[PDB]
Amino acid sequence: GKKKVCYYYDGDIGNYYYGQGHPMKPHRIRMTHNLLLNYGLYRKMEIYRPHKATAEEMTKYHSDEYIKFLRSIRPDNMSEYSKQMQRFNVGEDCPVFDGLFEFCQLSTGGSVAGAVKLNRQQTDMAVNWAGGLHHAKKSEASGFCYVNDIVLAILELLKYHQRVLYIDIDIHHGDGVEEAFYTTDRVMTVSFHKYGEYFPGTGDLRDIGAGKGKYYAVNFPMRDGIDDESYGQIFKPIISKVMEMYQPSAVVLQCGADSLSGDRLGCFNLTVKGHAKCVEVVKTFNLPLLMLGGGGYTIRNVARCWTYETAVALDCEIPNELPYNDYFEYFGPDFKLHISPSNMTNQNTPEYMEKIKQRLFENLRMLP
Ligand SMILES: CCN1CCC2(CC1)C[C@@H]2C(=O)N[C@@H](CCCCCC(O)(O)CC)c1ncc(-c2cc3ccccc3nc2OC)[nH]1
Ligand SMILES: [Ca+2]
Ligand SMILES: [Ca+2]
Ligand SMILES: [Zn+2]
What we know:
Ca(2+) 2 binds at residues 181, 184, 187, 216. With 368 residues, this protein is an alpha/beta fold. The protein has a single domain (1-368), classed as Arginase, Chain A (3-Layer(aba) Sandwich). It contains eleven helices and eight strands. It has helices at residues 27-38, 55-58, 64-72, 82-87, 100-119, 149-157, 175-180, 228-246, 272-283, 299-314, 350-364; strands at residues 5-8, 46-48, 125-128, 164-168, 187-194, 217-222, 250-254, 289-292. An eight-stranded parallel beta sheet has the order 2-1-3-8-7-4-5-6, with helices on both faces. Helix 1 links the parallel strand 1 and strand 2. Helix 1 (27-38) crosses helix 10, helix 8 (228-246) runs parallel beside helix 11 (350-364) and helix 9 (272-283) packs parallel to helix 10. The longest helix has 20 residues, at 100-119. It is globular and about 55 Å long. It binds ligand TV7, calcium ion (CA) (2 copies) and zinc ion. Residues 168-170, 172-174, 191-193 line the site of one calcium ion.
């Protein structure tokens, strides 16, 4: 039936700025919030302001030296940290910006707070659109990500859950999360992503885990132009098989919106309905679920996507006509919620999709 949804948001999140020209725009989190408020979706959710996660909470995964660096570095003292910036991959993709550490604290605080709420059985779903920063590593920033809020939230869920399933629908491979749990069977990581001449370069079909983690990492490599029809016919069968074999007791779903048609950095062709069908499929299993953000670089479409996915979490139907809102002009020329796919060629032939699905099913047969 209908579930209790807790949503985490800090009104300051939209003010963090990665710098002129940088595609990562935290303002998209504020556009999402404002749109979902104007649709009246606040009447049905418990809205919480995340605490600022401490350096200590972050060191449950990250190294002490890396977190000390993130808490110390600022644009005014950068010149004194040239050595550490190289060591921790702070540069063009992961710049130093005013309030960087506070941004990490809010992104992380929402994911960890959501995981605690799920552990206490005080909610069915917890949503943190400011989270999902899946590339961050133990001692290195990567791909616009500094602190891996996902890994920290999963470690929190592991306090009460024997098996946690992580699903990632961002266009980029979820490498930081896969690496963190690569040698354990207590987390199964499943990533659907563009593979081939594309960041971060990992996530081959043949990367299946190591040691006790062998068969607990699943990668579905895709080519440009995947559409709703194609994605939908592999997502539900793969997730249904993973559910059957792995029997997780909690799920974390990274909802990166850069897999939508028209994304500034992505090359896929999903609509908001096609992307949200993944949330519908996962929600159907009736397991404690943490829904997180991630990529998404055409910000009007990110706000549409995450607003519609919050309505899906709530089992609330919302009209296609957008309500007036603080960013109404960003949604022209149509002012509608749903988007149309482009005419781009889908390079993922139906035979390729079936063949990769079959190779993943062979690996899933290897689970106990
Ligand atoms: C130009 C910097 N250069 C660095 C070296 C490089 C090439 C790009 C090898 C690495 C790379 O390909 N990085 C990826 C990370 C992608 C991370 C996705 C994150 C998520 O999964 O969605 C989770 C949240 C990359 N692609 C696009 C950019 C990019 C960075 C910029 C920074 C400042 C200004 C403009 C910029 N414009 C950009 O695009 C137009 N970066
Ligand atoms: Ca992915
Ligand atoms: Ca694993
Ligand atoms: Zn991405």
